[PDB]
Amino acid sequence: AMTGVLRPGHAQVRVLNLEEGIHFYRNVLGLVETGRDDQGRVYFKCWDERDHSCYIIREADTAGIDFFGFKVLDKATLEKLDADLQAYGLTTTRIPAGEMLETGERVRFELPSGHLIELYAEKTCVGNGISEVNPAPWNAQREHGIAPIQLDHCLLYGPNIAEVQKIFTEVLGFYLVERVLSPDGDSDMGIWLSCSHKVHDIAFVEYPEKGKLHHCSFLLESWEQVLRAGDIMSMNEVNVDIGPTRHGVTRGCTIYAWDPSGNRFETFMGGYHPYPDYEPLSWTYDNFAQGLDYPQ
Amino acid sequence: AMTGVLRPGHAQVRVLNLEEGIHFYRNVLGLVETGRDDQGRVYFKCWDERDHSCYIIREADTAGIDFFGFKVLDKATLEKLDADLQAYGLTTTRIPAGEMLETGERVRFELPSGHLIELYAEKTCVGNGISEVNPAPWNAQREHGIAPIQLDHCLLYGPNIAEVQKIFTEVLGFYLVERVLSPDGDSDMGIWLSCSHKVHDIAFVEYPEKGKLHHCSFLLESWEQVLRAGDIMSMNEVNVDIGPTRHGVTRGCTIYAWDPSGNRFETFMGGYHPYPDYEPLSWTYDNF
Amino acid sequence: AMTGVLRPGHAQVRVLNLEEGIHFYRNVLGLVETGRDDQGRVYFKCWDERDHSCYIIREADTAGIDFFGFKVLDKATLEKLDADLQAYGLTTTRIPAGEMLETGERVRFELPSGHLIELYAEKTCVGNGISEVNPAPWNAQREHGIAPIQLDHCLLYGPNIAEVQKIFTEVLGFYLVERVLSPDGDSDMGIWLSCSHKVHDIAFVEYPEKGKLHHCSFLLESWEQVLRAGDIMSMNEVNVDIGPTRHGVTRGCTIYAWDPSGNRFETFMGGYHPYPDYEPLSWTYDNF
Amino acid sequence: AMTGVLRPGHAQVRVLNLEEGIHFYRNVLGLVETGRDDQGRVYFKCWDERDHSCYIIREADTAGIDFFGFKVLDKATLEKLDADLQAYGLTTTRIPAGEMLETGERVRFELPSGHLIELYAEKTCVGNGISEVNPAPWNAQREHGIAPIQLDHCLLYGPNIAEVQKIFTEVLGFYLVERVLSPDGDSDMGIWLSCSHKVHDIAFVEYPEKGKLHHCSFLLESWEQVLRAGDIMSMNEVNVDIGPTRHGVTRGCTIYAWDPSGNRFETFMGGYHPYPDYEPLSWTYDNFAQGLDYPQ
Ligand SMILES: Cc1ccc(O)c(O)c1
Ligand SMILES: Cc1ccc(O)c(O)c1
Ligand SMILES: Cc1ccc(O)c(O)c1
Ligand SMILES: [Fe+3]
Ligand SMILES: [Fe+3]
Ligand SMILES: [Fe+3]
Ligand SMILES: [Fe+3]
């Protein structure tokens, strides 16, 4: 069964221009807008998810990520984890229910890497736009812009990855799926963690600066959907970082692009199916180009 | 976190001709053979899996499924589940480690539907043919026969699916992803259960005769892999039940075919990503 | 170089309910409507084609095909073909330009199988909805309903297929790509002809009733588009003959579905690339 | 009907080492070796083609293309074209049958770009290994290495491209499918020519040096087959030039990779279906990069 931390729940990202951020994430990336609160934040979700939101933008003085949240099994689990975080020595903040639209109270804490993490058990279920009886495989939503299927994960850049790993694997019930070994005198330079049987729900890369956001990732259905994402990116003159290709790490096909404010995002699909009983895979530092781009 | 029952671990199926069975599963389905025991059973595993076996075939006078096993997180979980099964009212039998090659002891029990289910926490990890360091996405094994990636599930036909549902959801930690209503006599005629975030790890359909096996299912990479599987079946004179298509339930695109002995198996891919907190989808009997 | 007869130009089919015919062809199949004439006919084209029409519907009492036309290289070629058709022993009737919206004059004749074939060299070019400068690979149109790429061919049922083959290969510059042997009398019960390097531009099957239309066929981009077309059909309660699958007698995937009036159409993709110098492939009747 | 020049027939390429070439083309690219003559040349063909050869390699002190040939309808056609070429003002050479294994006589001539072109009508038909009766869609060969379907075309770099276009369109029966406009003072920097309904059977790009080969291209079945080709290249340490991506021109998906000797080749697929009555599409020079890489 899936217990404890279930999946990435939402990513709060700030854009320089809200208006063009709204247009981009709704008409280009194909996210479904789901509400706009009094703080000027607009909520989005993938057409296929069931919960109210998974991506929220806020016009800030700068770009980047405010926080990244994870939905847990239930309120009992939430309390349970908050307690384990404090027993571990981390200071937690309990954000009240309602602060975020259609969202319940959440437990927020800061990692050694500088990134703020959130844990919540409640968030209104709006459905995926498809009937609950005799549902079709998809609908027009699937063809609106790129239209990804779910917030798959995000990759953060910050210092002390080892400590971050410990909290995730010893406290949040995560486990190492893959790692990038730094130059001889081993220590993990990059770490891919899962709290399920997905290749990863979140990843971290050793970096001197803290609170850095490499990218938030969105799941696609097939390799042909990755191509189409690429075409859509070009049609909208979206700056692409790395064209359509495969990562060795996770074997996940992907494309890196930038949003109007410079926030990098990813549209990918594929990868194997690790379970908690599996041993992590490792990549040598010198061979990290292949782990990043596999064909190339 | 994935805890409790983790995933389908193995299916032991009966074949009327062991020789032809080994031939078909090794060449057509393209499963990797990993061993043969003294009883004459042959062990196979999908190439991308890491454990020693997931599909075992045993010659017999009748086709069908002997039992279906799920792997659990650890020994402590296995012991706990055994007690919950008994506390629930089910009789549990303990299979000694070693009885099945490279497999620890198992907790076996019989469902109201007639099928035998097993739980285990230990089974030797043999890997996926690829190195653990700087691993490649795939190798030649991926193109040997259909070459499915994992045993995905099975569909079992049994009489008391209502009580079966109770056991899987109330004892084993599974949950309802989808169901098929009964002629406005609204009872579930068919249920799809998941113990993870997969569309389903096992499924049952209401049926008068107990112990019936509808099919064991193997996962493929993509829709094009489904087509290739269809081509390979044809080159091998494989009897196909229903050509390549899409199931509304599960949304998975599959192909039903029969093995030489008459056992039906499935090669599919796709499906959404449900989670424990999701409500099940329903299908009207008439729209089945 | 491509010369003589170039490709299937248009197929005019009979629909029992004009309005519902327009709705199916423009919403489900996703063809682009290009005009309506004084006779009540509605014109469509595939989004990616460049000419004004490739598929015309006309309300009638019976479903079926009125005629199938091919576009030829130029006016000179058209004149030459007409003369050669006559010298061969066929009678030709010249239809004036404009008789069909945006269409030049046409050379029409009846095959021994009863079907009416037309040849023309003039058809207004309207574009594929994409700029001619810095053109994108596609646009919204490829996601409007099925959205096929081109009128690929048709399959006609008629008696006297052997004589039909002669006319096409000896007069129209076509060549045999594949054939289906007769039971053992050994003649051809079916033929797939090409006037390019496509697997087939038109095909025929020996059948008692003359002028029978089996289906018109539309080309798709990839195997996934075929799956998609399958889903759109189900969504629209479309009657499907045979679902997504591989042909074999042409090495291309496909779906046979029905028009609301009962006209079968095909959405497929794939196929190898034959050339005039290749020998035809053959199929035994039983294997067919 | 297809008449005149039917399609690309063969490319003879120079490799710096015949051994590394034979292991690479037969095992990595997945071509099928059909013969070897006493002159030290090894013949290859795609598994699905029917003729004896489409790709020939010869060991020399420099990489590059010796010549590119096209197959014509028949003998009469070959004579007609020879006469037309000479009547056009080009001198022609006749290579007797047999000079090349399993090949008939051919007409050779030089273009203003400095490339040697050949025309032939006779070449032994070996088949695709599959039966001619109740043939399967494919066999084990299509899973041998990349295993392309056909020699699709080649891209040649030279000068006097305008003169080259005139020869192919006014003499060899080809037509302009797409072109790349050169900065104001209209002329074409790039040209894609077809002698059938393929997006292109050959192309030329304006360049100083003469006789320069950009690459020979091989057709693949699908987008996923392109991804697989990239995976196989990585697996074989093959240096990749341009990762899996779409074009702009021709809509064709592709991957540019280098052989051991430095010769560039392409694994290609897709594209529309132009016909002789179609007007060519154009790409402005400034947009050339979208020309080569639509998505990025
Ligand atoms: C190296 C890598 C692998 C998989 C990802 O999703 C990603 O963002 C980075
Ligand atoms: C009815 C049904 C739906 C999905 C499946 O995977 C299956 O085996 C049966
Ligand atoms: C017999 C046959 C083979 C291929 C086709 O595309 C078709 O319509 C019919
Ligand atoms: Fe990522
Ligand atoms: Fe199944
Ligand atoms: Fe057809
Ligand atoms: Fe090329």
Side-chain angles (χ1 to χ4, degrees):
Chain A
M2 275 298 290
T3 58
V5 182
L6 302 181
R7 43 148 191 307
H10 60 213
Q12 177 95 85
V13 177
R14 37 176 195 276
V15 290
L16 313 172
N17 189 306
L18 228 182
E19 270 59 35
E20 67 189 318
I22 293 183
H23 167 77
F24 175 85
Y25 283 111
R26 213 224 293 191
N27 300 152
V28 180
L29 185 55
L31 272 41
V32 179
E33 184 174 315
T34 174
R36 310 172 75 175
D37 62 34
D38 45 290
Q39 295 177 56
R41 312 144 100 191
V42 53
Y43 306 66
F44 295 94
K45 73 177 280 285
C46 293
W47 72 270
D48 220 1
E49 303 173 313
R50 306 197 185 180
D51 285 350
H52 182 269
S53 68
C54 77
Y55 205 80
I56 315 95
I57 46 168
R58 174 178 68 86
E59 185 179 300
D61 196 357
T62 182
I65 181 171
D66 295 325
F67 56 85
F68 192 71
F70 288 98
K71 180 166 178 172
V72 305
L73 195 57
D74 45 50
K75 295 166 287 165
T77 310
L78 191 61
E79 302 302 337
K80 202 273 188 181
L81 292 164
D82 185 13
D84 302 320
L85 285 166
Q86 306 187 222
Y88 193 74
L90 294 170
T91 310
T92 69
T93 311
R94 172 73 90 277
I95 292 72
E99 201 284 346
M100 253 186 78
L101 243 174
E102 307 303 294
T103 315
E105 61 175 6
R106 350 136 208 175
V107 189
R108 188 191 299 176
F109 63 88
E110 192 187 309
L111 284 175
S113 58
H115 313 85
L116 311 187
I117 310 293
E118 269 186 27
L119 261 43
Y120 66 101
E122 295 178 57
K123 178 172 282 187
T124 304
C125 168
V126 194
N128 63 167
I130 299 177
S131 179
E132 291 180 353
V133 59
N134 297 329
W138 50 272
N139 69 329
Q141 295 176 293
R142 190 185 72 160
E143 308 179 75
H144 182 70
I146 304 177
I149 286 66
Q150 60 170 38
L151 168 70
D152 202 73
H153 61 278
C154 75
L155 192 170
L156 304 326
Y157 264 60
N160 317 303
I161 302 305
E163 290 186 16
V164 172
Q165 170 166 31
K166 297 188 282 74
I167 302 169
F168 275 85
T169 72
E170 300 195 315
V171 187
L172 291 318
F174 284 62
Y175 70 102
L176 232 190
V177 182
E178 279 195 49
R179 64 194 159 194
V180 171
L181 277 56
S182 60
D184 198 289
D186 307 317
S187 58
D188 308 318
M189 177 173 93
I191 276 175
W192 286 259
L193 313 163
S194 175
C195 58
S196 62
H197 60 257
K198 292 165 58 189
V199 271
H200 69 317
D201 288 278
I202 192 167
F204 293 87
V205 181
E206 191 73 53
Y207 195 61
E209 217 76 291
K210 66 168 65 189
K212 284 297 177 289
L213 173 272
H214 191 94
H215 73 267
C216 277
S217 180
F218 299 81
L219 185 61
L220 249 51
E221 285 274 85
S222 71
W223 180 224
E224 300 222 319
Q225 282 308 111
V226 177
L227 169 57
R228 161 169 193 297
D231 300 325
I232 299 171
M233 288 174 184
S234 180
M235 296 169 97
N236 296 85
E237 294 191 355
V238 179
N239 290 171
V240 178
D241 186 4
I242 185 63
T245 182
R246 159 118 67 182
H247 283 123
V249 171
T250 79
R251 311 175 174 180
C253 302
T254 184
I255 293 186
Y256 282 163
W258 278 291
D259 86 339
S261 305
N263 295 132
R264 179 190 289 112
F265 68 93
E266 170 193 49
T267 52
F268 92 110
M269 71 75 60
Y272 47 93
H273 306 288
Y275 281 86
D277 59 303
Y278 282 8
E279 276 282 286
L281 303 177
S282 302
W283 288 75
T284 57
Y285 180 79
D286 83 77
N287 201 263
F288 177 65
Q290 200 186 214
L292 203 303
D293 205 303
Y294 187 72
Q296 293 192 30
Chain B
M2 273 294 290
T3 180
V5 182
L6 297 179
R7 52 164 197 286
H10 60 246
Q12 182 164 295
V13 172
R14 297 187 296 277
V15 294
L16 310 170
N17 188 159
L18 181 59
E19 200 66 296
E20 295 183 358
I22 301 167
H23 179 205
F24 177 93
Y25 284 107
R26 180 79 197 84
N27 293 183
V28 185
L29 184 49
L31 267 24
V32 184
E33 184 183 299
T34 59
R36 312 190 179 202
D37 59 35
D38 311 316
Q39 293 165 62
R41 305 136 105 194
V42 179
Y43 297 50
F44 294 94
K45 70 172 285 290
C46 294
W47 73 268
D48 209 21
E49 294 176 321
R50 299 196 191 169
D51 283 359
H52 179 273
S53 74
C54 75
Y55 204 72
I56 296 92
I57 50 166
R58 167 182 82 74
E59 81 124 51
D61 257 0
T62 313
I65 186 168
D66 286 324
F67 53 81
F68 195 84
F70 288 91
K71 182 167 191 171
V72 297
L73 186 60
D74 50 42
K75 308 172 81 182
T77 298
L78 175 60
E79 299 298 341
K80 193 77 169 178
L81 259 34
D82 184 356
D84 294 337
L85 286 162
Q86 290 180 73
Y88 185 79
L90 298 171
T91 58
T92 284
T93 290
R94 197 62 160 248
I95 316 296
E99 197 282 344
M100 253 182 59
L101 296 187
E102 305 300 333
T103 307
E105 54 174 7
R106 307 156 252 159
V107 166
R108 186 182 295 171
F109 54 106
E110 183 181 340
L111 297 174
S113 65
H115 313 92
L116 287 178
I117 306 292
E118 297 189 346
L119 270 25
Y120 64 91
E122 328 232 57
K123 181 176 282 185
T124 311
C125 174
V126 298
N128 62 180
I130 300 163
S131 167
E132 182 135 56
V133 55
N134 304 308
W138 52 275
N139 68 295
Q141 296 193 302
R142 186 183 84 167
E143 319 208 310
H144 185 109
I146 295 160
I149 274 179
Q150 64 172 32
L151 168 75
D152 198 79
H153 62 276
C154 69
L155 201 190
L156 269 33
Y157 272 32
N160 299 306
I161 309 303
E163 191 156 302
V164 168
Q165 191 176 316
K166 308 287 292 303
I167 298 174
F168 275 83
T169 72
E170 296 186 9
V171 188
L172 280 4
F174 283 64
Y175 66 96
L176 242 182
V177 180
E178 290 199 36
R179 63 211 201 182
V180 173
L181 281 42
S182 55
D184 203 0
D186 268 63
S187 54
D188 301 320
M189 279 293 265
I191 55 172
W192 281 257
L193 311 167
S194 179
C195 59
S196 56
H197 55 261
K198 293 164 64 184
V199 274
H200 66 305
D201 287 284
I202 193 172
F204 295 81
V205 166
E206 174 66 34
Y207 200 66
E209 302 167 73
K210 48 167 64 187
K212 296 308 185 191
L213 177 268
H214 191 82
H215 67 277
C216 277
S217 174
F218 301 83
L219 177 66
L220 257 44
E221 308 256 22
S222 70
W223 178 229
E224 259 178 41
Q225 275 323 101
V226 181
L227 168 50
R228 198 188 68 111
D231 282 343
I232 291 169
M233 288 179 193
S234 183
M235 282 157 211
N236 292 92
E237 313 261 67
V238 172
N239 287 164
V240 181
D241 190 350
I242 177 62
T245 185
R246 159 107 75 189
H247 286 292
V249 182
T250 305
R251 293 190 194 177
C253 307
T254 182
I255 296 173
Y256 279 170
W258 289 286
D259 84 357
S261 293
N263 296 122
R264 179 188 288 95
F265 67 96
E266 166 184 52
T267 61
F268 85 115
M269 64 76 60
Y272 49 94
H273 312 272
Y275 282 90
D277 62 304
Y278 286 10
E279 293 278 301
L281 296 173
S282 306
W283 289 78
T284 49
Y285 181 80
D286 48 72
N287 193 46
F288 179 93
Chain C
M2 264 310 296
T3 219
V5 182
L6 304 177
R7 63 192 182 269
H10 59 234
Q12 179 168 294
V13 186
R14 296 189 290 285
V15 292
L16 308 173
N17 186 300
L18 208 272
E19 195 64 9
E20 97 182 0
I22 310 171
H23 168 281
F24 176 87
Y25 283 105
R26 83 175 289 161
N27 286 166
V28 188
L29 188 57
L31 266 35
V32 183
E33 182 179 311
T34 50
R36 301 189 180 192
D37 66 5
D38 305 346
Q39 316 187 214
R41 300 135 108 191
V42 179
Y43 299 68
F44 299 87
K45 60 171 278 158
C46 290
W47 70 268
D48 214 6
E49 293 168 327
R50 309 200 174 175
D51 286 357
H52 184 269
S53 75
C54 72
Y55 199 80
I56 301 85
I57 64 165
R58 166 184 86 77
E59 189 182 311
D61 282 352
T62 63
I65 187 167
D66 289 325
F67 58 79
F68 199 76
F70 295 91
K71 184 184 211 299
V72 303
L73 187 63
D74 47 38
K75 295 162 81 171
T77 301
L78 179 71
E79 298 304 343
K80 170 128 198 61
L81 269 301
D82 188 3
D84 298 345
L85 283 161
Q86 295 185 72
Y88 190 80
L90 296 178
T91 42
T92 64
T93 301
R94 207 95 141 212
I95 292 72
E99 195 279 343
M100 260 183 56
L101 288 175
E102 303 301 321
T103 304
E105 73 184 322
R106 297 159 276 147
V107 172
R108 180 181 299 175
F109 59 102
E110 189 178 327
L111 294 167
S113 47
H115 313 85
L116 297 178
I117 304 301
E118 311 194 340
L119 270 19
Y120 66 100
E122 256 96 313
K123 176 96 71 150
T124 314
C125 171
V126 293
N128 67 170
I130 306 179
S131 174
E132 186 177 60
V133 56
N134 301 313
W138 53 272
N139 59 46
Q141 293 181 301
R142 88 160 184 180
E143 313 192 306
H144 189 96
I146 290 175
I149 298 165
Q150 70 177 35
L151 164 66
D152 196 89
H153 63 270
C154 72
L155 201 204
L156 275 16
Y157 272 27
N160 300 312
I161 297 304
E163 302 231 68
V164 180
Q165 181 178 313
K166 266 199 180 60
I167 303 168
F168 275 89
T169 63
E170 303 194 6
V171 188
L172 272 26
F174 281 59
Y175 69 99
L176 233 192
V177 185
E178 294 217 40
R179 73 170 96 188
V180 172
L181 279 44
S182 73
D184 199 2
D186 259 58
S187 44
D188 298 325
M189 289 298 239
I191 55 176
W192 284 259
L193 311 160
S194 171
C195 62
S196 55
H197 59 260
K198 284 193 295 149
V199 274
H200 60 308
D201 287 289
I202 188 165
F204 293 82
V205 171
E206 185 67 34
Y207 197 67
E209 292 171 63
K210 314 164 74 167
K212 293 295 139 169
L213 181 252
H214 188 76
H215 73 275
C216 282
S217 174
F218 303 81
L219 179 58
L220 266 51
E221 304 259 4
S222 66
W223 171 236
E224 303 212 340
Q225 282 316 100
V226 181
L227 172 63
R228 174 175 179 276
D231 299 328
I232 300 181
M233 294 182 195
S234 187
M235 280 165 199
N236 285 97
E237 307 245 289
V238 174
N239 297 78
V240 177
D241 197 332
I242 54 173
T245 192
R246 166 88 71 177
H247 260 304
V249 292
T250 211
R251 292 176 48 180
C253 323
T254 175
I255 296 175
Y256 277 179
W258 284 291
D259 212 6
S261 300
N263 297 132
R264 185 201 281 84
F265 65 99
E266 177 192 49
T267 54
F268 85 112
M269 66 81 57
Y272 51 86
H273 315 272
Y275 278 88
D277 58 307
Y278 291 0
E279 277 292 302
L281 300 187
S282 81
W283 291 86
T284 59
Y285 184 76
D286 34 57
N287 187 286
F288 187 51
Chain D
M2 275 294 281
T3 48
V5 179
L6 304 180
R7 78 271 180 160
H10 60 216
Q12 189 171 293
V13 183
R14 301 184 299 276
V15 294
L16 272 51
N17 178 200
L18 225 198
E19 319 315 309
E20 283 180 59
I22 297 172
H23 170 268
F24 177 90
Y25 282 112
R26 180 106 138 298
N27 274 89
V28 183
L29 180 51
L31 259 44
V32 176
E33 190 186 307
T34 57
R36 300 188 180 186
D37 56 34
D38 47 48
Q39 297 163 57
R41 309 129 94 194
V42 52
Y43 300 66
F44 287 104
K45 83 168 197 73
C46 293
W47 72 269
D48 211 20
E49 304 171 313
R50 306 203 186 168
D51 293 359
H52 182 270
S53 78
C54 77
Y55 201 75
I56 299 93
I57 65 175
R58 181 174 71 78
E59 190 188 72
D61 282 62
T62 45
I65 182 168
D66 287 319
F67 57 80
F68 192 79
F70 284 98
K71 179 174 195 165
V72 305
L73 191 57
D74 48 42
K75 185 170 181 182
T77 293
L78 180 65
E79 298 309 320
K80 174 65 179 182
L81 293 165
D82 186 352
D84 292 324
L85 284 169
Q86 306 191 194
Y88 186 73
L90 295 173
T91 63
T92 269
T93 304
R94 223 82 190 303
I95 308 168
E99 198 275 343
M100 261 183 79
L101 277 174
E102 306 296 343
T103 309
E105 63 183 343
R106 34 223 164 81
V107 174
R108 185 179 292 167
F109 59 96
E110 189 171 315
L111 290 166
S113 53
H115 305 91
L116 303 189
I117 298 299
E118 225 166 65
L119 263 40
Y120 68 92
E122 300 226 61
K123 198 168 219 179
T124 311
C125 171
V126 62
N128 59 180
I130 302 174
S131 168
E132 325 181 316
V133 182
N134 304 320
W138 49 267
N139 52 32
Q141 303 170 296
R142 78 153 194 182
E143 280 171 359
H144 186 75
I146 301 169
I149 299 168
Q150 59 169 35
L151 165 64
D152 202 69
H153 57 273
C154 72
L155 206 201
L156 274 18
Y157 272 43
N160 297 309
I161 301 303
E163 284 179 286
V164 173
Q165 181 187 327
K166 297 193 180 75
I167 294 176
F168 278 86
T169 66
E170 302 177 7
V171 187
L172 304 168
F174 284 61
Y175 65 97
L176 206 172
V177 172
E178 285 201 48
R179 70 151 83 74
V180 166
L181 301 169
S182 70
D184 192 359
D186 208 66
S187 172
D188 296 357
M189 268 291 275
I191 229 70
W192 286 259
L193 313 169
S194 175
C195 64
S196 58
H197 60 258
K198 291 202 301 166
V199 56
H200 65 318
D201 289 276
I202 189 162
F204 292 88
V205 178
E206 187 62 61
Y207 196 74
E209 298 196 61
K210 296 168 65 170
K212 297 295 175 184
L213 164 62
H214 190 87
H215 72 277
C216 291
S217 173
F218 302 79
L219 182 80
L220 256 42
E221 286 268 305
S222 72
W223 183 217
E224 251 170 48
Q225 211 52 33
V226 183
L227 168 68
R228 161 174 188 286
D231 292 326
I232 296 166
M233 287 168 192
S234 189
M235 290 173 192
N236 292 89
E237 318 276 299
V238 176
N239 292 159
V240 180
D241 185 352
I242 312 301
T245 184
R246 154 124 56 200
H247 254 319
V249 184
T250 81
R251 304 183 192 176
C253 290
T254 179
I255 294 185
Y256 281 173
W258 283 292
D259 81 347
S261 297
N263 298 120
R264 182 197 283 92
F265 64 106
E266 169 189 54
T267 48
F268 174 94
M269 78 90 35
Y272 50 94
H273 314 280
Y275 277 82
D277 57 304
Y278 287 178
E279 298 307 305
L281 305 174
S282 309
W283 289 76
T284 52
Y285 192 79
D286 51 60
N287 210 60
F288 197 77
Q290 186 180 56
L292 238 176
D293 209 331
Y294 190 70
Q296 107 65 277

